[PDB]
Structure formats: C-alpha cells, structure tokens
Amino acid sequence: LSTASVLAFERKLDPSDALMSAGAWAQRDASQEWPAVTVREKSVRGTISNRLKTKDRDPAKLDASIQSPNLQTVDVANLPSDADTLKVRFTLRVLGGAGTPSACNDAAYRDKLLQTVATYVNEQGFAELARRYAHNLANARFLWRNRVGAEAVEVRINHIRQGEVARTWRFDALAIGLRDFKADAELDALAELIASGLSGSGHVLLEVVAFARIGDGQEVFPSQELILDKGDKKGQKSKTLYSVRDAAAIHSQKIGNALRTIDTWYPDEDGLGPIAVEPYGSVTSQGKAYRQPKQKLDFYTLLDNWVLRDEAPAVEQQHYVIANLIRGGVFGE
Amino acid sequence: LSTASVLAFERKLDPSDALMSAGAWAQRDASQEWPAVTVREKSVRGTISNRLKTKDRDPAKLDASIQSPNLQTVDVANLPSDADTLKVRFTLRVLGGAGTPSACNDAAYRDKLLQTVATYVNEQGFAELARRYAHNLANARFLWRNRVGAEAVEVRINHIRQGEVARTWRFDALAIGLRDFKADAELDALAELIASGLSGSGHVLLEVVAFARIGDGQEVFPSQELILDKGDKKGQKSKTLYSVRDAAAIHSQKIGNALRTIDTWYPDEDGLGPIAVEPYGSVTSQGKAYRQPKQKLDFYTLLDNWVLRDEAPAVEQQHYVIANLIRGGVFGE
Amino acid sequence: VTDPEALLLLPRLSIQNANAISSPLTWGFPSPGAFTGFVHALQRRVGISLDIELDGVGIVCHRFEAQISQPAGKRTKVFNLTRNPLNRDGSTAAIVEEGRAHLEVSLLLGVHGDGLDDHPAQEIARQVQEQAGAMRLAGGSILPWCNERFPAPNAELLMLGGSDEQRRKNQRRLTRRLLPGFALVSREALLQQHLETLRTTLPEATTLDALLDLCRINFEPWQVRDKPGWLVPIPAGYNALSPLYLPGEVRNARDRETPLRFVENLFGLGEWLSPHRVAALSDLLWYHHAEPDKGLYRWSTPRFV
Amino acid sequence: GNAAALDVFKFLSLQYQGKNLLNWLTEDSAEAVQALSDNAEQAREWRQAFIGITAVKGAPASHSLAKQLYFPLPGSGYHLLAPLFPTSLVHHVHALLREARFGDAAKA
RNA sequence: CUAAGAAAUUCACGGCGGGCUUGAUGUCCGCGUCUACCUGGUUCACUGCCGUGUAGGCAG
C-alpha cells in the first residue's frame, strides 16, 4: 500500500473569535453587561533605535537622521480608567470522529487508517490528549500577552448541553502553571468531557470566559491584522488591531494555536516547555523547527511507518500523531 | 558565536495613559470626583514671524502678506477659572524578568545573554536603576510642561496589592530636584519596592497621582496628536490634543519617556543632567546623539562586547545596558 | 422543477471565517453553490435517515462583515491574511491570499417527502438544527450557541396546507422573522433583456455584465444611470472545458470512485430584494441541476416570478 | 511553467504579424521552409519547436491543492470537478478595467 | 459532500514651539381654526371583630 494522493483532515476543537470586555474585580459573576474594549488610534513619535550599518556610523549623518521626526499612527486598546479586569470570552465546540479524513483518493489506505485509529482508541482513550487540552483550557494560555504579569487570572468553563448550562468549572489559572501537567478531580472530569466529545460519543459545546486582573486603564493585547504594504504610495498606519463589531478580539486561529500547545515530546529538549503540534513542529517565535525529517520523529514519516509499514511508534509519539489528526491539515504529495 | 538575527524585548515598566482633571488645592485628598479637563477649540489669527527667504524681503510683498493674515482653529485645554490645581493620574506596573527576550533565533545567544543578565543581578541588584526610576516618579517629571513654573507639586504614590491600597508615599516633587539623585528613607523604600518588582520577586502595581498648583484658568498641556492634512472642509484645524473619551490626556509613551530619564553616564557631559535611555541616546529637543557609535558607548557595541567577547564594561555602562533591556525594543538585523 | 411540500427555516445562522472571494472575479458574498452544497450535505447526513429529501436554498444575509482594509492612499481594498506556520527549514511560508468574512444568514429549505407523516415537525427541525450545528457552511465554521437564546427553534411550515388566504397569512408571519435581511434571486431574464437592448450597439456579453453593475455616470445631455434594485455579479455555475473522465484515469483525484471533469466558472447577475416583495415564499429556492451531456452544472432559482 | 526563455514567446509574434512564420510555425510549416532560411535540418528543428510550444498536455493531473469538488447529479451520484483559473478571462477584464479606470478618455 | 480540506503578525517609540479675526447694518406688511361628544359601566380587592394562630370564619 501507499499514501493517498489527496488527504484532508477537518479540524476538531473549533474555537470562536475571543471577544474582550472590561470591568471591575468581584463583579465578574455579573459580568454580562460589561462593555466591550474598543480600539482607538493614537500618534507616536520615536527616534532612530535600530542597528545601523557599518557604512552609516557617520555622526553628522546620524544627527541629520535624528532631526527628521519619525511619526506613526498606531491602533491601541486599553482598559477603562475605572476598570481593572479584562474579560475574554470564546466558545469551543468538540465534534468527534477524529479519524476520518474529509478526502482520500485511496480506499484501502483510508480503511487501514480507520482501523489504525480505531486500534489506537482501543489501546487507550483520548485521556492524555484530552487532559492536556483541558490543561491548556485550565491555565489561560489563550491570554497571550494579557496573562503576562497579570495579578490573578481565573477561568470559567460552561458545558452547555441544551439552551441552558449543563456544568461549570472554576479554575485559578495562575496555580496551574504553563510548564507541567498536573492532575485534579475537576480537571480530570473536564478531561473526561473533552475525551467523550472527541470520541464521537457526543457533541460537546463549551463557553470559556477568562478574567485577568491587570490594572486600571492598562493596555490589553488583541490580535494584529495583516496589511501588505502599499510600497510606492503614502505611509500607512503601522499597527492594526482585530475587532469584531467594535469590540477588541483575538483571532480564532490564535486561540487554536494556544490550545494545542501540548507537545512535550520533541527530541531537542523537554524543559523549554510544550509547543504547538504541527508536522515538522516549528514555533514561529524561535524561528526554528523541532522534529526535523532527518530524524525519524516528524509527523509524516511517523504516519507512514505506522500505517504503511505497520511500525507502531512509542505511545507519546502516537499521542503526537493523534493530536496532529485532531489538529487537521492538508497532507499529500 | 554571533548575535541573533531577530531579538525583541517586551517592555517592563508599563504605564497607562495619564488622565487630567482639575480642582482646588487643599481639596486634593478628596480629589476623586474632580471633573476632567476638557479640550475646547478657539480661533487664532497668525501673524508673520518666520525668517524670510531674502528673495522675498521686499517691503511691498511683506506689507501685502501682513495685510491678509491667515487663521486657524486650535485645540486648547485650560483649568477652570475657579480651580487652580491640575491632577494627573495614571497606573504603572512593574513586572520583572527583564533579561528574557520575547523572540530569538540562536539558542546559544539567548543562553549567554540570560547568564550575562543573571551575573549582572548577582553582582548588584536592581537598586540603582529602581532608585533612579523612583526618583523620576518622586519628582513629577512626567508632567512635562505642566511642571514648569508650578508653585507647588505633590505626588501621591499608592502601591496597590489587592483591590485596595497597600502603601502610600507622599513626595514634594519640587524639593526632589530634576538634577541629582539624593537619598531619602521613603524614596529608598519605594526603590526597594520597584527593585523587588523588577527582580520577579513580586507583582508591582502603582497608582501615581500628581497635583500641580498652576493657577486659576491657566493653560495645561496634554499630549498632542498628529495632523496630516488641513483644508476648509475642517475648521482649518492646525492643532489637535489627545483625549481619552472626554478628558485631556497624556500619551503613555510620554510618561514612559519621562520615567526612564535616568542616563547620567553619557560621555559628552554630566552637567546637563539625565537623558532618556535610548540606543544611541538621543534627544529630539536637541537634535543630537549622545553615545555615538564612533565612540564605544552606544548600546549595541556595549552589548556585543559584553555578551559575545565577554568584555564587561564599567558598572555605569552596565546599568545603562540593563536599563535599555528594561526599556525593550527590536534589536537585530 | 419540483414544488416543495413544506418549508424549514434555519433561523439565524452565525458564521465566522467564511470564504469571501469564492470566484476569480467577485469578492463579496459567497456563491450560492456553497449553500446548495450545504443543503445536499445536510441531506446526506440527516436528510436520508428521516424519509426526507431537500431540494433548494433561500438565503437572506442578515449581516455581513468582511475582513478587509483600505490601504490609505487608494480607493481600492486589500484582504486581511493570517500568519501560517513556518516551513520545514524554518525560513518562512509562501503567502497565498485568502479572504475571510463573517456572516449572519437564514436558510429556507424545501421538503417533499414524508414530512409530517413519519415524524412531527418539531423533532425534525430540532435534529436538523443539532446536525447543522456541527459542520461548516462556506469554508468557515458555523458559530455555535451564544447569548442569542431567543432565535433558536425552527419553523417547519407546510407550503400548500390550509386555506390559500391562510397560506398567505402563515407565509407572511414566516416572512416576519426574515425582514432584517434581503433575499437573493437570479436575474438571467433581466440580463438577457439588457443584453438584447445593448446589442443594438455592439454584440458582446461580458461587457454587459460589466456595465450592468457599476455606477454609470453619463455626462450633460452629470447624471447616474440606475437599475431599480441591487444588481450584483454572481458565479452563475460551472461549464466544463474538458470532456468526461473516468475515476481512474486522472491522477490526484479526490476519489477514484467518482468521474471527473475540468471546468470553468460561469458568471451571472443576481439580485438582493426585500422579502416582502415576493408573495410566494417558495420562489426563492436555489436549486442546482446538472446537464452532464455537456458542461452545464448550474445553480439558479427557477420559478421565482 | 518555469521557462525564462521568453524570446521564443516574443518570436512567435515577431514574424506573426504580416508573416505566416509566427502563425504557421506551430502547425502546417510550409511557410517555415522559407522561415528557417536554411536546409531541412533548421526548418525541421524550427517546426518541432513550434509544434512543441503550444502542445496540449493530454494526460490530466489534478492535485491536493487544486480544489476538487463534488457536484450532485439528477437523482444519482456525484461528479468530480476541478476549476481552472481563467487567466485569459481575468486578463481581458483587467484590460477592460484599466481602460475604464485609467486612460485619457476616462480622464477627460 | 460547500473554489472543500490547514494556518500565531510582532516587538519598541516625546509631535510642540508661536500667534488680536476685525470693523458696519431697519425684517416686514396681512390673516375667522371651526363643528360634536356619558370614560370608569365591580380596576374604591376596604374597614373592623371572634379566634394563640398566618388555620378558618364573621359584620357593613
């Protein structure tokens, strides 16, 4: 058998665009009429601060470059001056049926894939991957820079079965670290819920609301937009923040990248912490790709060794390739 | 070993936007419902006062330009006619973890930089830098032109631990000069608090309120926005002041620039006084770069000598390099 | 071609990150082929198992929110992108532009089979809601339940059941829940009418669909020549540029059990109109039909006026 | 493709206007006998290159990144569809939109 | 079975310097608003008494 020419996995764990609002601490139970954090503009004047070339040391030329003022317009987002708590809310739906691709050219390859993932669920459940997903929901890893230096972060998760809430979870997101993976009875019950949603045994819907206690009037950090440059034109606004209906927001893919930061089995190290799961597992902040294909630990060769060659890898690498199956992708030649 | 291609430091010492309000002196302890200073418009007839080209210094052309003067609309902010004291309020968080960059390429470079900063912390604490930051908070240097010619300035600083005030400092901001760094018991306690915040040994949030006794109805100076174009479809508006919702305000980078005005070790002189810590430490009001790269005292050459070639500079320049690390920035190719 | 026995209303569907481009000539609302593919996939997933068939879509678009921007020196607009992960060498990616948007739309679906016979209307509508709240519509996720607690349940409304005046009254009370938006219809006859009255000057057809949907500024005989409604370009469908191919003879097919063809995009004119302007609510249903003897894979809404 | 030799694409129209060499070089190269200006070897090489220029691929090849789509049939299964990017059509409407937006008549 | 399936923009910043808008002025003539009505028909669920009682009744 060979790999299929087309292979396409729909993503599970679909998040919403996380919307921001603001209020005071100890009002967070009544945090439904909290007004949205809006995006404003302001003006910045800076100086010459980057590295200069060795041909451009030239102190008269540097003084000439200083005396031309450097001005930009910058999108900014702040809390109100009487509110010290940022409330970030998104919804997350778990679907199940993680093994079936959305497209496969080879029928025998997709049947071998289906029996492979069926045997994987038969050997053990999703409980390791589901426990790590519940960890990334437990600590507020989706608060990307809003969590850095926060006083107290607190996460509420509401499983909504019918039109009302079915269950609630209450977590202190600063007690649960970002490095190691603990075990807690509420966290394991939430892990059982996300595992049962991933197994096709139901359709799980969660509403996640995080309260960070930052400070009065402080700056929050929503997503930034992509503006490709109008090069032979006027100067542009050199920052643009994401907003949904005049409310500061984080992208859905940003929360999704924050959720799947579970990979602690990459061969380079283990003390730097978990990274996000992807084939040739590469983090954009470091600019360097762990799980290189010259070692046999990337997703593609592991999948080909498990399915085509029937070499089942180690159980943490089975967790890794199953997490890549939940993450999805367009795989092929 | 070489320097990394990308390297970025998030800023510690995050201030908020400073808001302005007005009131009477000796009611400043009850200065919670003080009404905000509003930005109004007024009309300005501009006289002819520029230098002439001397190809246009003919007397008939000069009198013809004087006969038809031009007119603008100008944003202005004054105190009320019954209030003589300006109150300026902001919040500042001290975070800690100043050595770790938020982006890097080389692992060896960031490890060498991390142990260099760790050895800097081990030789001496953050006590000099936090002492100078507490000085720039003690004198109300963040009142840029509002401090000039004031009768009396008083700064109230509140360390805010839970949702209530943990500690209170009271400073006579004109007794603490803008020139030299004295020694005071309450100022050293504030410096120890800021140093404990910078070392990661605590979460520091401060509320800084400044009262300046300027006079009845006098003009205050909020931050000033940027105007690209001007026409008759507007009111020929030529000056725009910054404003949060409905209040005259100061940009957060203005307060931040007045906070880090601590650099007294620049090689040109020291009788002028401290400047803000910048790479190639420059003053826009003077149009000149102190710490030119022709001398060996800018930030980049000092950092490359300290990290790559282990040439640790003098302890004053070590304070300068670590203050530039606390300021943050984009350092790289 | 088939009058539906009853009508189901997918009430207020919120959609994030849906595709906006959907065509190499238009960028606005997505093509109606996506909605016909949605109702066919819903017929596959839950429609078959209830002795129900689904035929067409009516769409009204309560709200639109494109992820675009104006680049500060030009009257045109650019698309907002996302940062893809790095390559295997960790250098960068290859920027391929995609256009995302946010939608609020209702769906009107017709049924012909044993609707009220085997099952009641409420349980059918509720399980179709539960099925459609697990998939995606136009490349973007169906946004799940939020604090919109009011607009949840559907309304399976019998089309020909009851008195004819009572039929107009219940379709008017169904149109009462679809007033915020404006429905979309095909305008091939108005396209052909303007094409024949333009062909007195020159015999070209795509120049018509250019000149139908812009702001034509005619000089002093300074006026603007205008159409009475909201005329938009729509992808009219699919026309094959290659003959029929067997499942196995083409490499890298999606399935080696389904015949393949190479196709080109037919573009046409659509119309956004207020839903009170059409008296019979079964007029708005977008059907897709295949004429596989030639290339015509068409989506439209016949029986509309 | 990836051919940087655009001189052949220029020479397809260099003798195409007013001459049958650039128009008959792809097929029916009877004018290519004088179009080579030499013996049968150069004329045969020119005719072979002109025939290989506009030659169809024949054997079809889709991709994963080629937008394969199902279309339902009237009461039966499905058909697979791969849309091509209409490069000539978008170039035609790009020329029309440049003539509408720019140009001296539109400026006047 | 949806031009399907997949995705982290981001780090840092001093916009302020200064100014006389002025002089002068007639708003004004004239006018038909009328005709005809049940709001309260229990929306006044009150006041006091016996009874330890809020349980239950009474009297106007």
Rg of chain C, alpha carbons: 21 Å
Total count of strands of chain C: 14
Distance between the termini of chain A: 15 Å
Separation of the first and last Cα atoms of chain C = 14 Å
Number of strands of chain A: 16
Helix/strand/pairing class of chain A, anyone?
A: alpha+beta
Radius of gyration of chain A: 23 Å
Give the count of structural domains of chain C. Answer: 2
**What's the domain count of chain A?**
2
Number of helices of chain C: 6
Written overview of the protein:
Chain C: InterPro entries: CRISPR-assoc_prot_Csy2. This is part of a larger assembly, with 2 copies of chain A (333 residues), 1 copy of chain C (305 residues) and 1 copy of chain D (108 residues). Chain A has 333 residues and is α+β, with helices and mostly antiparallel strands. Chain A has 2 domains: 1-10 and 98-125 and 262-333, no CATH class; 11-97 and 126-261, no CATH class. Chain A is 24% helix and 23% strand. Chain A is built from 7 helices and 16 strands. Chain C folds into 2 domains: 4-181, no CATH class; 182-301, no CATH class. In chain C, the strands form 4 sheets. In chain C, strands 1, 2, 3, 6 and 7 form a 5-stranded antiparallel sheet that branches. Chain C has a 5-stranded antiparallel sheet with strand order 8-12-11-14-13, covered by helices on one side. In chain C, helix 1 (32-47) packs across helix 3 (121-132). By secondary structure, chain D is mainly α. In chain D, strands 1-2 form a two-stranded antiparallel ribbon. Chain D starts with 6 loop residues before the first helix and ends with a helix. The chains are: A alpha+beta (333), C alpha+beta (305), D mainly alpha (108). The A-C interface holds A 5-6, 10, 14, 16-17, 32, 91, 93, 95, 103-107, 160, 163, 203, 205, 207, 225-228, 230, 233-237, 240, 244-245, 251-253, 278, 280, 282-284, 287-289, 292-293, 298, 332-333 and C 16-17, 65, 69, 71-74, 78, 80-83, 85-90, 95, 102, 130, 133-134, 136, 141, 143-147, 149, 152, 251-257. The structure holds one RNA strand of 60 nucleotides.
